[PDB]
Automatic annotation (TrEMBL):
Keyword Lyase assigned: yes
Sequence similarity: Belongs to the terpene synthase family. Tpsa subfamily.
UniProt protein name: Sabinene synthase
Keyword Lyase belongs to the record: yes
Cofactor(s) needed for function: Mn(2+); Mg(2+)
GO terms of biological process kind: diterpenoid biosynthetic process; green leaf volatile biosynthetic process
InterPro entries with a match to the protein in the record: Isoprenoid_synthase_dom_sf (IPR008949), Terpene_cyclase-like_1_C (IPR034741), Terpene_cyclase_plant_C1 (IPR044814), Terpene_synth_N (IPR001906), Terpene_synth_N_sf (IPR036965), Terpene_synthase-like (IPR050148), Terpene_synthase_metal-bd (IPR005630), Terpenoid_cyclase/PrenylTrfase (IPR008930)
Organism domain of life: Eukaryota
Gene Ontology MF: a single term: terpene synthase activity
Amino acid sequence: QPYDDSHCMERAERLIGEIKDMFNESGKFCGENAFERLVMVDKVQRLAIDRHFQNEIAQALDYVYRYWSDCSRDLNSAALGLRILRLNRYPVSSDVLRHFKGNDGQFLCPSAQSEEEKIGSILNLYRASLIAFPEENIMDEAKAFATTYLNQVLQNNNISSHLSKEIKYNLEYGWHTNLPRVEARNYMDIYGENRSWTEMGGNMQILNLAKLDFNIMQSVHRLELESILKWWKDSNLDKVDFARHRHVEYFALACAYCIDAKYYAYRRDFAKLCALATIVDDIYDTYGTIEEIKLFNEAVKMWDSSLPNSLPENIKIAYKAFHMAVNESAEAAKKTQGRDILPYARKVWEHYLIGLTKEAEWLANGYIPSLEEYLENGAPSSGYRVTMLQPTLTLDALLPDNILLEMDYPSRFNELLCLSLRLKGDTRTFELVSGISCYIKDHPGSSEEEALDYLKDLLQKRLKELDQEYLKPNNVPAISKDHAYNIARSYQLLYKERDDIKDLVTQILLEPIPL
């Protein structure tokens, strides 16, 4: 073969084999060991090496679910199993947390736990409470108790460096403003700095596999980044001026959950269509005559390869790049989807421009819509769906039109995905038509603060609906739904970072982890 496996790859493939053996061993164990298998799933999942053990994890969680009433004997294991089983789409209930709920909103650890073990139990409680479904008030109580408790722990020191780091990480990132490889990069340090953890069982093999896989795949992604930089140069977007160097940030976001080398079309197309979507938004919003907006819309509806050779050079090159990127992505998607998807794809972009055009009309006409009208048009206009559909269609999971209507527009999943992006953006303390203003118009005399609180709360509620819908089973390939969901998470994380994203680019793309 022209290219050999690198020595890191060989070491990783050997470690994968040994860890599969550990998974099969605990399965052969004559006896109930649901927690032990749960704890092993936990480690390889937090370290985001779980894609190498899909059969071994499925067998372990099937066994954990079967023995679930056995496994959930204390606060720690109930909270851990609740989060992991739920995130993997088993029908488990937050009621399991009631067995440990006492008075004054306090939750109960076994009394023989060391202080460090108590903190570990509460962290798993905190981590579980973040995956809340609508009407699970036990989750809000769990989150509130664990927050107050974990903050008190930090106030007093008395705790080790690695455990202290674990609290701060978990409190700062939560679940929604977070991504798998972000968590994995943090747990390489949280586990690796824990002497007792590294000394136990096969933990060191698991950690080294995670470091190896991180460094291996980062170098694949750093290679792919080159091709993206060439596209920026070739397309002349480097001269757009009104453009912004953010195609690298978007690429890194995608890398922090779409990992495998075969999914380079997904990674590439998310970074391009998302940077394009940002460019097109700045055109329709800030720079460009209503004439030119109309010509753009006409060009898109006709799918012209080019705009009138009279329009400003900026709008001219942005259109060409747009038309080309979309075409390439659809050709990529024809390979996996085994069908033409350019027609479908074009309708998606049309719906996006229709949405951005309406906001242009409104600002031009002094029209302040009602909040409900704003949010409904805000779904296609946020740009979520045009950064999501085409890249997802290039994955190796067929989304037949029948099933697309369950992930794409007009599905409830897609609608909750868009509202998360829209509501998060419209709640940033970083405009005549906004979430704030439309609300004020809907509620005369409302304070600007009074509007912020209502949209912040509504986002909390929509996120819970989103999660319930995300984890509800259907005939839709999970990997497709996971990518769509992780896009929305990447955007939540992006807004957290903007309000550093550069550190996130460095960790994901540029700097390897010392072994």
